[model samples]
Target: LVGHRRFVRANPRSDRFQALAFHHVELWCADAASAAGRFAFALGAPLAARSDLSTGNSAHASLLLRSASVAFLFTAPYGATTASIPSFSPGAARRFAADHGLAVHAVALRVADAADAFRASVAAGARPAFQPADLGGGFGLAEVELYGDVVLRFVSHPDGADAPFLPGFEGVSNPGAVDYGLRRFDHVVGNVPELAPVAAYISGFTGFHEFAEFTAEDVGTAESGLNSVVLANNAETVLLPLNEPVHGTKRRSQIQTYLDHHGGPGVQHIALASDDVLGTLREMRARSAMGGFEFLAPPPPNYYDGVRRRAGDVLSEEQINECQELGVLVDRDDQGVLLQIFTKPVGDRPTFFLEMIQRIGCMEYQKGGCGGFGKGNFSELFKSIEEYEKSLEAKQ
Candidate 1:
């Protein structure tokens, strides 16, 4: 949970667990209903609820999770249009095509300081991608280039204060059809290369800390390998998972593949907060259209049993089993509990996926949850790589 102090404090806050906390977690989807619904369904197993189907927005679809400590909102563009429903802003309806979904709500972008934010970014070696410019009607936007291929954009309103961070996205009048009681985007996680200076460089500019670190040994599959570090604001309002390649038999790891595809190190995944993982996953899968990316491959059954043992008295066997069945992974610190899950990568490369989470109290990343990135469910990730390799071999 973020506080007024951390938001305004001068000294760097210690990285430790807190007993009582409030925060948001966001899940990324393809902006395809079937995919989002599958997520909704997986979350539903725990919530025992169904997503509301009455809403008509098409650009993006989401299930709101209000019951958990944090409220979740899912927003992603279907294609390139920013106005798709579940859009970036309330006014998105006018700027989008009829087939596209209407923009749903606003998302926030945080900076360490006002005047120093951009200057610091440049001084820290961030290149100029888009200069801060007024979007008119009392709006402004800033975009920057980092680590070569990666770009960072910041949006703001003239008021200088609001709920959702990103510009143009404001809450809508229609109550989101689904009701998971989701609130807002909590943090974003990415997979970056270990050798790249981007993560360390960005930390200096954004005041983001290397809050957590994990290796392929922490989470991996027979198919994939990764090394990662997380950069986050003191308030946990902005979290970035920077990832890179690790040594493996294959020449290309998931993070390497993304860097190659996206043109550089950038965001790997977006973690969405959900009060009920079961319901959200289930509904999301049901509505997904991308050949069922939601249900393709869930973590092995034993993953749940392990979490139950680790959780001790905090979460019951039933709760653990429920989450396990829904594909959500559970992690806890002395302070509290958090439930999270990851979706399959959207394309051949490890470019994008959804992370659904419920933070009851814990703040630590689900480190070692899946044996880093090389061993856990690595078989799946590796399979992806093999396919890409084969495609390359064929081209040759």
Candidate 2:
């Protein structure tokens, strides 16, 4: 049973705290120093208060974005074990609060279902470092080594609200520490084999329900081929788009490559929502809290030109350009305006990424742009992906 524990005994010297909380999103920091810097800047700190243990090639870092009040514990290594850090001690807590501009909400596991799949995975010749067990609240967690340096975890929650899912974390006294008033996790996306069997496994095991779907024909580029089916949960909270490859002449499909590298199916990206996307992104970019910054592709300058000729009252040229410059993408409906942007891959394995979004008034994803999250921009994004892959292959 998942019930709140008021006082859980813990030792200050232990490697892990007795009670830990997991946030919805855990960002994997491939560039540890850069990630630490980004977090410090975003949270208005001179330095971050991290565990004293030598990170020593550790590829994962858990971040609690003060502005958004959301947590992400991401893994940077493609095939490394998930490491555990000693819980925030009283002194560490003080430093976290005073330094990082927010309280340490939770420490997330790098992968989902880390506990149940451990022994079986090892038996199947899969090497995993972390095993699933009750971290005090029946929170079973395990991390599986995937292609390259990426890792995936599986979580089993017997209770809904206790410890939240991560280990070695408790609650903070101040509610105002949450700067952005963010709410729940929205959806996650993945690049998988286009095969039906793989999709079925994800559904049968993960409990994700299929909500929306599309194909390369619907959203593809000449250089890269990809298709997708969006699987969501009953609450409409966890949205995951599974992708696969289609035949293309110029280059290998991104989905196909992802599957190949991962040695199987794995996460491609994660999308989170904000009440104010523009303000959030502006702060993130201006502070250099994000990585791999690039300019967005404008619609040939003709789309904007045509908009001036047709829908003068709807939006202005300057507004459109502003959105593009900020790396923000805009889509509109008669009902409302929605703004969103995606981040480049966060790790070396090409397994994980992040998305930030804001809806002025609409609760829908994409503001009804193309019924799927950024699927309309497939051509532009695919071309870029292919170009990068070619560059990498040439180097290799």
Q: Against the hidden reference, what TM-scores do the models get?
A: 0.61, 0.60
lDDT of 1: 0.48
Provide the global lDDT of candidate 2 against the true structure. 0.46
lDDT tens readout by residue for model 1, 1-396? 121112332326432212012232333333434434444444331221212223333444444433343343454443323332221332332232122222112223533322344556676666766566655455555555544433454444444334432333344333344444444454555555553476767776666665555555555445556666666565544556666776654445666766666554455655556555566666666645645455334457876677777785888777776776676656665555667666666543445565666666433643212211222233333444446445666877
Identify the runs in model 1 with alpha carbons over 4 angstroms from their true place: 1-108, 111-116, 158-176, 194-196, 220-224, 248-252, 260-263, 288-296, 347-350, 362-396
Give the number of colliding residue pairs in candidate 2. Answer: 34
| Top candidate, metric lDDT | 1
Give lDDT tens digits, candidate 2, residues 306-389: 434443455566656665566555554444444556565544455445666654443544332122344344445566566656
Residues forming the 10-long window of minimal summed lDDT in candidate 2: 1-10
